[PDB]
Design a protein around this ligand. Structure first.
Ligand code: SAM
Ligand code: SF4
Ligand code: SF4
Ligand code: CL
Length: 327
């Protein structure tokens, strides 16, 4: 059984104001605690977890994030953090010294003049870039997450060159996800500008993980551009739900992947309880029931999947295994 990924949404509070995210301007007060993490760590070890990725709102706003990285690393976990990068240059040295194995910075444009507008945070792009360079110089694996849609797809060729030159080693490029329909004026022009990004030489240009954000097959691309269904795990089964646990810290919920799958006709909270009788328990029968539904139904019903997760599941299907840091 494979090294699993544990996501912890440490908090919802954030310091940015992204148009597409429910946590924009959140001052929410929940903070996943060091005490919660100490109870969780042995459960994660015995559940087969080899990676712990902190996310939420903005993990660098969590005052204990470096200590959480320390304790995770001392238990043999590969620690990762997803950040908008605003505070990354100030904290990257302490995070690297605490054992941080990977930093993920979210960049949604090819320059400060566009990214800082989309996140309404002047200086965020430059600080993210600084932090990525410093992370690489400190031996931390640098990855970038990008959310692409009709508003920024023309910037992706430029962002590819920026990331390549900066020494970023992984790049998730995945579609904007919204409740409302998302339409592009000219899908052929999206392919015209972004096919060269995926068709670049992977040893000279950084090529995104997994599937193309608009789909790999004509059928996937038709479905993305016409009915706003994003690419998802293909074939008959989604294998991500065996290797990923996502903890919504604030509520009490564990999900079987980081896109937090929800049944259509289901008002109840998604996923499964993180606690049974106030005790943290992973892979509970309720969780396995949740994961089993999407293992078989995910490829059919999931509308908010990511390019990274879809390519991960497909490699398990085609090759029976994944490389390190493929999620
Ligand atoms: C919710 S953020 C939290 C971590 C950190 N604040 C950051 O932005 O990197 C986690 C990831 O989800 C992405 N994301 C947020 N809203 C999205 C949306 N509506 N559609 C697709 N991705 C989204 C962000 O760009 C980010 O890479
Ligand atoms: S910085 Fe991250 S958590 Fe904050 S609003 Fe943007 S995507 Fe959401
Ligand atoms: S297909 Fe569904 S359950 Fe599987 S990784 Fe994608 S969003 Fe998650
Ligand atoms: Cl890949």
């Amino acid at each position: 059984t494979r090294e699993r990924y544990l996501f912890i949404r440490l908090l919802e509070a954030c310091n940015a104001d992204c148009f597409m995210c429910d946590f924009a301007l959140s001052r929410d007060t929940f903070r996943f605690s060091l005490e919660d993490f100490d109870e969780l760590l042995p459960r994660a070890v015995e559940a087969g977890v080899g990676y712990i990725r902190f996310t939420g709102g903005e993990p660098l706003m969590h005052t204990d994030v470096a200590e959480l990285v320390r304790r995770g690393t001392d238990a043999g976990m590969k620690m990762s953090i997803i950040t908008n990068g605003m505070m990354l240059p100030r904290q990257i040295e302490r995070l690297a010294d605490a054992g941080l194995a990977q930093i993920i910075v979210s960049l949604d444009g090819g320059s400060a003049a566009t990214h800082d507008v989309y996140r309404r945070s002047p200086g965020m792009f430059d600080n993210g870039l600084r932090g990525l360079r410093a992370a690489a110089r400190l031996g931390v694996l640098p990855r970038v997450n990008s959310v692409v849609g009709p508003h920024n797809y023309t910037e992706m060729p430029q962002l590819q060159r920026v990331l390549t030159e900066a020494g970023v080693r992984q790049w998730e490029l995945s579609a904007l996800k919204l409740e409302r329909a998302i339409s592009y004026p000219d899908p052929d022009h999206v392919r015209a500008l972004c096919d060269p990004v995926y068709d670049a030489d992977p040893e000279h240009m950084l090529v995104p993980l997994g599937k193309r954000f608009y789909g790999d097959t004509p059928e996937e691309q038709e479905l993305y551009f016409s009915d706003s269904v994003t690419p998802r795990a293909s074939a008959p089964l989604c294998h991500v739900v065996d290797d990923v646990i996502y903890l919504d810290g604030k509520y009490g919920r564990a999900y079987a992947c980081s896109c937090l799958p929800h049944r259509e006709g289901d008002d109840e909270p998604g996923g499964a309880p993180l606690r049974e009788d106030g005790v943290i328990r992973l892979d509970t029968p309720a969780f396995r029931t949740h994961a089993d539904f999407f293992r078989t139904e995910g490829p059919r019903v999931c509308n908010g999947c990511s390019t990274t997760a879809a390519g991960y599941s497909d490699d398990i299907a085609r090759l029976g295994g994944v490389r390190p840091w493929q999620y």
